[model samples]
Target: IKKHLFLLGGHDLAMQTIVQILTDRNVIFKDRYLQWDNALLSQYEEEIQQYGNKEPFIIYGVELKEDITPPTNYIRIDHHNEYATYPSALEQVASILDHPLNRYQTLVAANDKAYIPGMLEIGASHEEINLIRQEDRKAQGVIEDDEKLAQEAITNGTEKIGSLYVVFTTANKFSPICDRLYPYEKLLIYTPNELIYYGKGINSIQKILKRYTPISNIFWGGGINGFIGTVRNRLTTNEILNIVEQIKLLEL
Candidate 1:
């Protein structure tokens, strides 16, 4: 069973903090950040020889450009706009970890923001999600029978209710939803942009949290791509641990 997961970001500050946190947790380091040329397992020859006896090591790398692949034993933590946005990258990682081929236990510690919604349990249905593509078609000057597309997607089942809606556009769709929902229930939007970009969406959510809920946690989801593209409950650390434990039990 794999007990530890190490994450390294391409950016120096985030990588430094992530490395520090994992190290404080006593997680073994397979190897530190190596340049593109040294991203392979063989490149960590000495470190592997030293730590291979300790435990399995998984390396993570962020892609700065498209069409660039990482080395073996390395997973690409991509955030390319062209490749399905941030949520898509996270979903891909989730799929890999959940795949049958991965026998060892795994944990993902990422700042990509998409993971937050999955953790919080707010997302949309596949059919509702298809509306994004339809919106894209309208953006691209291709709108044939748009009302049918909208109706087919909107008239949905309960199963589709929790699916997320990741809007990559600059338009703040969550605003209206927040306004409408605020009277009946509390709503909070967490994103890295407030701290990083000083945006109004996160600021508004923070204000609401301060006034409404005393006990609430906000996981940093970044921009439109960072937002889980849906609403959800907050995820607890114990929940994460339970998931890891479940994976272990299943493997056994």
Candidate 2:
């Protein structure tokens, strides 16, 4: 049997946590760390050039947003684009490793699949969730900077659009803001990578979001009956507001 090379696609805690699990299990696998971005195709292309002729590999969470053919004979374990399930990459990795998830691991997976509020639903205390989120923010390289921005976003206050409450901010991480929006309210968050609607009722805007999200893997959501809008070539502020108007109409 050919040994599998593990290609970690992003710095997300989901990806790194899996790496630690894989290591602890003494899984005999080689690894290469790469960024998940528009250049992912070329990045994988180069990896194939260097390693494909030598070994089989499993790709985890390195979601490719392009239309090119994947490297031949490579296995992909992703929940975002090609993988239809809403399970976080860690959840899948745990299944593969036959590792039972502890509450902390469960919260981590929940955060990946449904963001900060998801952990709250699982009966996690806000303090514990903050610690988990703090680790995640550090892993994603947004810990201190985004926390400050989330604080600023709080100072900036929220806006009411119809029945929805919106907070527009430049912070890339949402967990810092999401915790503040609860103990329950209809909320929408605008960030650099995506627009998050965290509330009950209504399905995703996948069909509606298709217009602006030309890249396939750059968009994902709807597992929790909420929508997370586009990341690349995203909807304009006006366009996003229009979508919110449509969402308010759907609520009625």
Candidate 3:
């Protein structure tokens, strides 16, 4: 028997589905919210080196800060940065299992990689996309309180900073905020824990912000169209606002 140990990343719907598939196959695995900067597996070192240790380790969608040499009995399945254009983790998993993705799983795979645009590319209807997104939010521990906070933030009205519409709030989840602020071309949401930006000018916005500091410093990360804050050291809302102000001035 080929004993495989799996390490899952991110608690989103796609990852949940992967867990479901693996569980059905009777595979043992560990799940955690690992980050790109420090994806250490030393915590599993004991199990990895135990008797009958020829078992291969499998990583899914978790980005590593640097190339990890050795561990020849391992496989990493990811589709970001260097593999940005590749199929999503779910898609690759399906291929490995020799199973075709169903309609919902296909949409889930698309949304996992490209967000809304990915869904749209596969011709997913708005209604279908909403359901997947809602499930994803729920899987990530979003609740009524988060939506209420987002609604309160929206009612307060967004401040216009150059072409960017900025909102300061205590809401931790950006999904709800993005739901309300989709009309804005450029959006910046300032929360105590993290600063989030998305919209048409995200590329330019991220470009300018990277000049002030490296992504590694702030742990800044996101997709092609948006970015959010770091997991370890968080910037104050004021600090992010100040950075946005400079970005606005630089656009002049």
Q: Write the per-residue lDDT of candidate 2 for residues 73-158, one digit (tens) a residue.
A: 56566665435355777887788768998888898888777766678789889698778877886776666787888888877856
lDDT of 1 by residue, 161-208 (tens): 112221111122233222222222122222222111112243333333
- Candidate 3 Cα deviation (angstroms), residue 203: 4.2
TM-score of each: 0.25, 0.76, 0.78
Return the TM-score for candidate 2, rounded to 2 decimals.
Answer: 0.76
lDDT of each: 0.33, 0.63, 0.65
Clashes by residue pair, model 1: 122-231, 123-162, 123-163, 123-164, 124-163, 124-164, 165-229
Ranking of models by lDDT: 3, 2, 1
Off by over 4 Å in 2: 26-41, 53-68, 81-84, 120-123, 161-163, 191-194, 201-204, 211-218, 233-238
Question: lDDT: which is higher, 1 or 2?
Answer: 2
Which lDDT tens digits does candidate 3 get at residues 79-187?
A: 6544555677777777876777788988888777767777888899989988988997887677899999988988885677766777878876767887666645567
Residue 83 deviation, candidate 2, in Å? 3.8
In the order shown, what is each candidate's alpha-carbon RMSD? 19.2, 3.6, 3.8
Candidate 3 segments whose C-alpha is farther than 4 A from its true place? 1-3, 32-70, 161-163, 201-203, 217-223, 226-228, 236-238
